[PDB]
């Protein structure tokens, strides 16, 4: 009884506990069974990234994304998408563009095409990811360099037009400490963009922790919430060593922040992690729930 | 771990290979183990029809391109497939009822895939899983609509597109010499080749339950009696992964002159299509399992 973290988190008033996946996870291991039972939202591990979806200008690849969207619909799961504008996994045809009008239109087309395809089916998009340097200045990607800092407002405005139903998020990593310049900076810039009417509905904190860093998220998450977005989230969570303590502290940070809609982990089982040697996830290599999973369950159960 | 690929090459074979794809290469320890221990890679999913031509004339090559490029960069041989198969088949194909229309759809798919990687692919599986367990031909959309001759056409079309690729009809349940399916594919391939159909190979999609490794020692020589220049063991996995089934498996290949190699159907057990049986050669912690160490000792 009372072993789904998603079901338990919803009972506490949150939207979901989610997980990244894709077609070949769904067809292998025990991923599909675990997601069916335990998780309420799925995100494309890779199939919606720019290198996967638009490998040459205007030529899109949607087989993988479609597979995930369909599976999520068939299994009654919410679906997230992203990242629409991101410097990593970004084809060389984009990064070679030097003309402002041409990159603006290429960016807008990428956004619009993905969001239109899935219009009305996607809870939330990560519209812009990893836009910040560690010092809090904006990262000098092709977007910044060629379009300028208006590429962020343009990306969100384009997204809202493409699918007004989706929650639109900015996401970044190393927003885990409240004193860190990057944390402070994304709040200040998101406040300013929202004051200019940019439709930033959420800040997503891509939470990749080392052992003992869970505690600090209890202060960093409320600070992100202070930017005034309707939502914030913990995304792509993983924790080197998968201490119960670190995991429960992240969880509780979300519970404590009224605008935090949920938490997503960056895969199901350790061996399928990008950092497997750190065993950073909630299920082991035999697909058994780990102590951290059980400690989340106890944390979320109610009297 | 000592490399089963290098050891099998030392025994005169071409390769010991493995199925993989982009997201395996960027997670777990898969890239490192493939680099060290395997000499050929196959696309787990990225060259299947559903992945590559999800609507008519709309091709998706990013995933396949990634694999091909990784293989080149790391000095690995590459295989492709499956070009004609009833599983992971878009409904736009299976809904076709006209003979010419489907013949042309089948040809265009084959040609477009094989032409993009021309010269890079050691071997294609042109046809897979074409047989019923009783040895008759599986009543797929291609047999129902185009007829028997779909198999000859598929092989023929494959040769024109890349004359340097080894062409392999493939099937499963070819694991026992006494099984009707095994004798059946041998007879048909003999006749197709007599008529000049360019079938260079038969591959044995070898999905075994416990204890079935022993029978491969007679089934593979029977497959090789069809007279193809090559045969292979493909997509190998064995429920329970005991050393007996797999060594016994390593040795069927070694005993059959025309067998070019063996490929396993993934690296580590949790990434198997069947994982609770812990049936591959590396465990959920990416350790080499007793069956990997037994293969190494057998090949030394
Ligand atoms: O929470 N996630 O693990 C996760 C994974 C991939 C994504 N792409 N866009 N948002 C994403 C979220
Ligand atoms: O040996 N293989 O594991 C393997 C995997 C996928 C394939 N597709 N076509 N032939 C294939 C062989």
Curated annotation (Swiss-Prot), chain A:
Presence of the UniProt keyword Signal in the record: yes
GO molecular function: endo-1,4-beta-xylanase activity
Disulfide bonds: 254-260
Keywords recorded for this protein, A-Z: Carbohydrate metabolism, Disulfide bond, Glycosidase, Hydrolase, Polysaccharide degradation, Pyrrolidone carboxylic acid, Signal, Xylan degradation
Keyword set includes Hydrolase: yes
Domain of life: Eukaryota
Gene Ontology biological process terms in this record: xylan catabolic process
Top-level class of the enzyme under EC nomenclature: hydrolase
Positions of the GH10 domain: 2-299
Entry's EC annotation: 3.2.1.8
Active site: 130 (proton donor), 236 (nucleophile)
Annotated catalysed reactions: Endohydrolysis of (1->4)-beta-D-xylosidic linkages in xylans
Family according to the record: Belongs to the glycosyl hydrolase 10 (cellulase F) family.
Family annotation (PANTHER family): ENDO-1,4-BETA-XYLANASE C (PTHR31490:SF76), GLYCOSYL HYDROLASE (PTHR31490)
Protein name as catalogued: Endo-1,4-beta-xylanase
Species annotation: Thermoascus aurantiacus
From Swiss-Prot, chain B:
The GH10 domain, residue ranges: 1-298
Recorded GO MF terms: endo-1,4-beta-xylanase activity
SUPFAM superfamilies: (Trans)glycosidases (SSF51445)
UniProt-annotated catalytic positions: 129, 235
Disulfide bonds: 253-259
EC code(s) of this entry: 3.2.1.8
Enzymatic reactions: Endohydrolysis of (1->4)-beta-D-xylosidic linkages in xylans
UniProt keywords, alphabetically: Carbohydrate metabolism, Disulfide bond, Glycosidase, Hydrolase, Polysaccharide degradation, Pyrrolidone carboxylic acid, Signal, Xylan degradation
A GO BP annotation: xylan catabolic process
Source species, domain of life: Eukaryota
PROSITE patterns: GH10_1 (PS00591), GH10_2 (PS51760)
Pfam family, one: Glyco_hydro_10
Entry's family note: Belongs to the glycosyl hydrolase 10 (cellulase F) family.
The protein's name: Endo-1,4-beta-xylanase
Organism for this UniProt entry: Thermoascus aurantiacus
Gene name linked to the record: XYNA
């Amino acid at each position: 009884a009372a072993q789904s973290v998603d079901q338990l988190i919803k009972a506490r008033g949150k939207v979901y506990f989610g997980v990244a996946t894709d077609q070949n996870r769904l067809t292998t291991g025990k991923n599909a069974a675990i997601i069916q039972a335990d998780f309420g939202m799925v995100w494309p591990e890779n199939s919606m990234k720019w290198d996967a979806t638009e490998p040459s200008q205007g030529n899109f690849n949607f087989a993988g994304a479609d597979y995930l969207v369909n599976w999520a619909q068939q299994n009654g799961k919410l679906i997230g998408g992203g990242m629409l504008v991101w410097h990593s996994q970004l084809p060389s045809w984009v990064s070679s563009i030097t003309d402002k009008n041409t990159l603006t239109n290429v960016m807008k087309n990428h956004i619009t095409t993905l969001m239109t395809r899935y219009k009305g089916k996607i809870r939330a998009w990560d519209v812009v990811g990893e836009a910040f340097n560690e010092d809090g200045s904006l990262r000098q990607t092709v977007f910044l360099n060629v379009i300028g800092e208006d590429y962020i407002p343009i990306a969100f405005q384009t997204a809202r037009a493409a699918d007004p139903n989706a929650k639109l998020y900015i996401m970044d990593y190393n927003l885990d400490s409240a004193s860190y310049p990057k944390t402070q900076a994304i709040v200040n810039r998101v406040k300013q963009w929202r004051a200019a009417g940019v439709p930033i509905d959420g800040i997503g904190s891509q939470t990749h922790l080392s052992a003992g860093q869970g505690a600090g998220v209890l202060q960093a998450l409320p600070l992100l919430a202070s930017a005034g977005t309707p939502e914030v989230s913990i995304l792509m969570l993983d924790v080197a060593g998968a201490s119960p303590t670190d995991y429960v502290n992240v969880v509780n940070a979300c519970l404590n922040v009224q605008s935090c809609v949920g938490i997503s982990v960056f895969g199901v089982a350790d061996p399928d992690s990008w950092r497997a040697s750190t065993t950073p996830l909630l299920f082991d290599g035999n697909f058994n729930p780990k102590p951290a999973y059980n400690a989340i369950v106890q944390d979320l159960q109610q009297g």
